[PDB]
Tab-separated table of C-alpha atoms in Angstrom:
chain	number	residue	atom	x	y	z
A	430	UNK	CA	100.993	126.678	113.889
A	431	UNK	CA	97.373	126.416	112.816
A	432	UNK	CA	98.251	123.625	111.111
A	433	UNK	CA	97.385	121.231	114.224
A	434	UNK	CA	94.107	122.977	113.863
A	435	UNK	CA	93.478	121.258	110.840
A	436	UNK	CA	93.000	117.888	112.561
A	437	UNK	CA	90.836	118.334	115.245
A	438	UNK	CA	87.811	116.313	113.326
A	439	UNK	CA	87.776	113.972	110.829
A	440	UNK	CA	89.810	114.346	107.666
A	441	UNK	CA	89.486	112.322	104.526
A	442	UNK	CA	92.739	110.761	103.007
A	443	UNK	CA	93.425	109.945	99.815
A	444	UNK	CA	96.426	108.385	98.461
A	445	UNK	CA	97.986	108.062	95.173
A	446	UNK	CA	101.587	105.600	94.357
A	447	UNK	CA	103.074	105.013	91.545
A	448	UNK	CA	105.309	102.735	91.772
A	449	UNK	CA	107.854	100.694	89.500
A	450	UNK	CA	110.376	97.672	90.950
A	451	UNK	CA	112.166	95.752	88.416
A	452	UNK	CA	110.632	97.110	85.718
A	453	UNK	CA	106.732	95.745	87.008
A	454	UNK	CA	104.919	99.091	87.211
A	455	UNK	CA	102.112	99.217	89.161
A	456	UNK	CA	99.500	102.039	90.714
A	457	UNK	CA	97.767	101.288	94.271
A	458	UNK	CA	95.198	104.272	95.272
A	459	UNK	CA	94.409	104.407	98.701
A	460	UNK	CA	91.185	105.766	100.874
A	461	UNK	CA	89.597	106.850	104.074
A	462	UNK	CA	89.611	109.001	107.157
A	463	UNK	CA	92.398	109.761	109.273
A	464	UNK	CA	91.059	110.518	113.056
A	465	UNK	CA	94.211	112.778	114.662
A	466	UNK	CA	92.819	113.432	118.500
A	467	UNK	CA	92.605	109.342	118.768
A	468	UNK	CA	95.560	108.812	116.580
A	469	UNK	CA	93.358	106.690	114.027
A	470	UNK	CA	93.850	106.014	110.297
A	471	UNK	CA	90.887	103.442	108.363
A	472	UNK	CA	92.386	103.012	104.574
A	473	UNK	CA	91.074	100.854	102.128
A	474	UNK	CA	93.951	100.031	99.791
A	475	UNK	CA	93.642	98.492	96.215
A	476	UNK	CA	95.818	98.205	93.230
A	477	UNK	CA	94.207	99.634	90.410
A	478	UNK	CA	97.077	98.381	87.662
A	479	UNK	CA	95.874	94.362	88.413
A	480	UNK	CA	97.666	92.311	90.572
A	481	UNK	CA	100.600	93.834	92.931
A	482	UNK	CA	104.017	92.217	91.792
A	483	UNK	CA	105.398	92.824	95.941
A	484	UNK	CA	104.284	91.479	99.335
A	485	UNK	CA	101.602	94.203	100.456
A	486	UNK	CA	103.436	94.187	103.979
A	487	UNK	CA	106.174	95.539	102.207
A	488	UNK	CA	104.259	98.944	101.086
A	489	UNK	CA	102.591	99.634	104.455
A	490	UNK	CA	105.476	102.439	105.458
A	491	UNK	CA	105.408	103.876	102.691
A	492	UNK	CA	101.159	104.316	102.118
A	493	UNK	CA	100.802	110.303	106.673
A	494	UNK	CA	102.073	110.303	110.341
A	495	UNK	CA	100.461	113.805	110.534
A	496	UNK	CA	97.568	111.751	111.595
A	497	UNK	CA	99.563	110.998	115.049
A	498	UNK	CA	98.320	111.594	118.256
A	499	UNK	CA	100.927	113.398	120.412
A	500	UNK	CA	99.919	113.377	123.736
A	501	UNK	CA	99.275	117.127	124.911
A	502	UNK	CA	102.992	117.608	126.875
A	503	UNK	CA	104.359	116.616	123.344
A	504	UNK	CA	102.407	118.683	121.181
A	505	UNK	CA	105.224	121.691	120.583
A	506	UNK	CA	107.226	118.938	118.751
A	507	UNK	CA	104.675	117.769	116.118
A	508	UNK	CA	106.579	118.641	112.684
A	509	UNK	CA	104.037	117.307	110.150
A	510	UNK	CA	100.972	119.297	111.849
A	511	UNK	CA	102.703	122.281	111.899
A	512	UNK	CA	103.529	122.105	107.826
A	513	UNK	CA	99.793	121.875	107.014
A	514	UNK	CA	98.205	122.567	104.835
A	515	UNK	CA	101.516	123.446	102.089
A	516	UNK	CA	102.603	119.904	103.863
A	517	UNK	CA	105.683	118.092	103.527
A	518	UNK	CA	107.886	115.818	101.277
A	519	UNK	CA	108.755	112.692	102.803
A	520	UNK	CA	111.672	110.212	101.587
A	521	UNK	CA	112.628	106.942	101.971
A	522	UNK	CA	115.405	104.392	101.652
A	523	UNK	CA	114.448	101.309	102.350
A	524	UNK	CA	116.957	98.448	102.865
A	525	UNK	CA	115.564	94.875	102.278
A	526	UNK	CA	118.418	92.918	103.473
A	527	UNK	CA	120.033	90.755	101.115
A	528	UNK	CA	117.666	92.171	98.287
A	529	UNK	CA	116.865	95.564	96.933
A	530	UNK	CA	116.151	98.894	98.040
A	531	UNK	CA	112.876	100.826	97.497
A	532	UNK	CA	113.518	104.302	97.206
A	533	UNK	CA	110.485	106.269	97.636
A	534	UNK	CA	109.090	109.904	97.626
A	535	UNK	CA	106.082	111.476	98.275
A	536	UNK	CA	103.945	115.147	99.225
A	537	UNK	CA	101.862	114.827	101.607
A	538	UNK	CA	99.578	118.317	101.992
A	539	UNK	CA	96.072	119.204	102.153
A	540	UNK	CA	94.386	119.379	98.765
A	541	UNK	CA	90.684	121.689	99.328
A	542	UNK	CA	89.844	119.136	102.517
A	543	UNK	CA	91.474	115.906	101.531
A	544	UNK	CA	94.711	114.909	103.080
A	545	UNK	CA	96.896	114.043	99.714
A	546	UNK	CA	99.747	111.760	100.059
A	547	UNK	CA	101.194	111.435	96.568
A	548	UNK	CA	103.947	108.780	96.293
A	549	UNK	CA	106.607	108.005	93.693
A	550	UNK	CA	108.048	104.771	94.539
A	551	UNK	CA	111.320	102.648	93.193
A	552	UNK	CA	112.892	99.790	93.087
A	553	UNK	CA	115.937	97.937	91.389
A	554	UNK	CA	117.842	95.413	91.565
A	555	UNK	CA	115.457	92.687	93.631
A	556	UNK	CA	115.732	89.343	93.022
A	557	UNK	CA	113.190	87.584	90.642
A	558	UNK	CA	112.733	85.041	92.925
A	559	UNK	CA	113.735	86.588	96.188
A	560	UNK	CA	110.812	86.757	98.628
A	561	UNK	CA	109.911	89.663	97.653
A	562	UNK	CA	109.127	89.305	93.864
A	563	UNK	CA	108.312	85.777	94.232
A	564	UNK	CA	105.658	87.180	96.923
A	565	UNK	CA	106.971	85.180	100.102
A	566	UNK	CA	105.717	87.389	102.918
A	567	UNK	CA	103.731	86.920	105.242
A	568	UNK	CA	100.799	88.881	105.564
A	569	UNK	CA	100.913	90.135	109.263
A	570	UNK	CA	100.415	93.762	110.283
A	571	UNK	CA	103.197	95.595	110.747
A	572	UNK	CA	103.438	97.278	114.142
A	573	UNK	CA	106.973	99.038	115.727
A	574	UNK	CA	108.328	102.808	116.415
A	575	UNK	CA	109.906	105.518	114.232
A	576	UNK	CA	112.453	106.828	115.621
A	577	UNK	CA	112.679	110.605	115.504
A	578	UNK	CA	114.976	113.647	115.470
A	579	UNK	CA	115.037	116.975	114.199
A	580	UNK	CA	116.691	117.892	111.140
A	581	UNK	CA	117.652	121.432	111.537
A	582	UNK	CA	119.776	122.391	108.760
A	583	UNK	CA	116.994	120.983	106.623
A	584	UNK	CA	114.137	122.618	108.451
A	585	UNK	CA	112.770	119.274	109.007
A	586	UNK	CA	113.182	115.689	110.419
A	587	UNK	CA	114.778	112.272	110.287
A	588	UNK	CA	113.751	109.174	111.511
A	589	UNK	CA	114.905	105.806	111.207
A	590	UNK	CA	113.696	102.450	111.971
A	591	UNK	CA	113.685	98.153	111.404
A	592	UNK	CA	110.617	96.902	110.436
A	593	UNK	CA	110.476	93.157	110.754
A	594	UNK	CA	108.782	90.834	108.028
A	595	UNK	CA	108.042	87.482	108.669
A	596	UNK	CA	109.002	85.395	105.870
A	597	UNK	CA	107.147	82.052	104.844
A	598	UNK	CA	110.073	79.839	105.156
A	599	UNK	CA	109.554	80.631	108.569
A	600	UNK	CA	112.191	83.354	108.380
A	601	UNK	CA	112.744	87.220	109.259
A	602	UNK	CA	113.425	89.449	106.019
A	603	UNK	CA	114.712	92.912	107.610
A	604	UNK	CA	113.725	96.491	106.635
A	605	UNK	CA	115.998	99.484	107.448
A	606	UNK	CA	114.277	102.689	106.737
A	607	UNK	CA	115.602	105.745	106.435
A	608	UNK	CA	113.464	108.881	106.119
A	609	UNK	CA	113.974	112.257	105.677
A	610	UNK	CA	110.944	114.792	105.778
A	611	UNK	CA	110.815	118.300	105.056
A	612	UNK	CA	108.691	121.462	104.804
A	613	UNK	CA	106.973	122.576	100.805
A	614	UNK	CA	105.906	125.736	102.754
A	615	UNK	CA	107.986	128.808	104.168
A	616	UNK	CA	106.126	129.138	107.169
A	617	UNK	CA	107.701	128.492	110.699
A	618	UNK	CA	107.427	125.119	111.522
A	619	UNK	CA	108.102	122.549	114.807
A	620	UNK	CA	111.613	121.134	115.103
A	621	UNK	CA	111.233	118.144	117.386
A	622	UNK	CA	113.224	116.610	120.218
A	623	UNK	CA	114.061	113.426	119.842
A	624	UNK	CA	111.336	110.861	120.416
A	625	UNK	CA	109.258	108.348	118.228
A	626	UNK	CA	105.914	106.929	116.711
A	627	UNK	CA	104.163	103.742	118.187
A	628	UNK	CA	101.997	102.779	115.262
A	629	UNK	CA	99.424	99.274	116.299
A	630	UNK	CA	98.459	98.238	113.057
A	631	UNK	CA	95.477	95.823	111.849
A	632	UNK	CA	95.780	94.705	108.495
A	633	UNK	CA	92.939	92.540	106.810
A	634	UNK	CA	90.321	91.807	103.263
A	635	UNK	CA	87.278	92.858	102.362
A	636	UNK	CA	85.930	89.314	101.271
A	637	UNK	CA	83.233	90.657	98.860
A	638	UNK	CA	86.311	92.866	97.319
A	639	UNK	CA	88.256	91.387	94.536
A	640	UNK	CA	90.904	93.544	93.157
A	641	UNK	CA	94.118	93.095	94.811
A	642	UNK	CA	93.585	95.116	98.220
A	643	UNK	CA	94.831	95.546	101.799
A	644	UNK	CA	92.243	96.982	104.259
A	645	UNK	CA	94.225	98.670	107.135
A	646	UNK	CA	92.989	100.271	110.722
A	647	UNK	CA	96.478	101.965	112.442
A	648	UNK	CA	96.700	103.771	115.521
A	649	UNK	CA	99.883	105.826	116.013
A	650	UNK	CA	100.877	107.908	119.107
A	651	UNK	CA	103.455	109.562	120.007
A	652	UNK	CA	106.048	109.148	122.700
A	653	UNK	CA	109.677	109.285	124.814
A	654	UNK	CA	109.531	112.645	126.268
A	655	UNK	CA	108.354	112.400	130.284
A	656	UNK	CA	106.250	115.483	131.605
């Protein structure tokens, strides 16, 4: 596809959730310049409704792994390049055990130059005073794989990982995601073999910022098929 054209330079992102967990709704806008050939997203993250009623950490999956580097001998199984620019919806279950779920959906596609990921986001069900609501995570980046594997029947892809939160009471809250991702455009896309994403994330503040905000630098390549 010319899609993995598309990335060969620079590419502003912007990003747009609206979100709503309990009840609390809130709106976090999100951007930067996603850097494909070095794998490289810079965000700037704030929330524009006031203060954000979750643990930032727990929103980082869900704020465009078309900005992946796949090594060269992996490129014929890059699905989200190949859907640009009519993109692709992504969804997600995630499973905060013993808590909630977020259930989330977005569109990620090319809007003029910008790289839009739109994202509807829900939750129910959470504790009030869980660690999540009562905002008891940590504030680490969040590094690990997705797994992936084509979906065929759907056109698209699965993946599925555990993210891992540390919790303040020096405990691990887990986070089973389940995604689904498939193509808004007709066009012929790339149905992957099975391999994964190795995102290396930094997560940090702007000091002289202060809205509620997470500044983020992420590096994701991918990986599991030998050549």
């Amino acid at each position: 596809s010319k899609g993995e054209k598309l990335f060969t330079g620079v590419v502003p992102i912007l990003v747009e959730l609206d979100g709503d967990v309990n009840g609390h709704k809130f709106s976090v806008s999100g951007e930067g310049e996603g850097d494909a050939t070095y794998g490289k997203m810079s965000l700037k993250f704030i929330c524009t409704t006031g203060k954000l009623p979750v643990p930032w950490p727990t929103l980082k999956t869900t704020l465009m792994q078309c900005f992946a580097r796949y090594p060269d001998h992996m490129k014929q199984h890059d699905f989200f390049k190949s859907a640009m620019p009519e993109g692709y919806v992504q969804e997600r279950t995630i499973f905060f055990k013993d808590d909630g779920n977020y259930k989330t959906r977005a569109e990620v596609k090319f809007e003029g130059d910008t790289l839009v990921n739109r994202i509807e986001l829900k939750g129910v069900d959470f504790k009030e005073d869980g660690n999540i609501l009562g905002h008891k995570l940590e504030y680490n980046a969040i590094s690990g794989n997705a797994n992936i594997t084509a979906d065929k029947q759907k056109n698209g892809i699965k993946a599925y990982f555990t993210i891992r939160h540390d919790v303040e009471d020096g405990s691990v809250l887990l986070a089973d995601h389940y995604q689904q991702n498939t193509p808004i455009g007709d066009g012929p896309v790339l149905l992957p073999d099975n391999h994964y994403l190795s995102t290396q994330s930094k997560q940090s503040k702007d000091p002289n910022e202060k809205r509620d905000h997470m500044v983020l630098l992420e590096f994701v390549t991918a990986a599991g098929i030998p050549l």
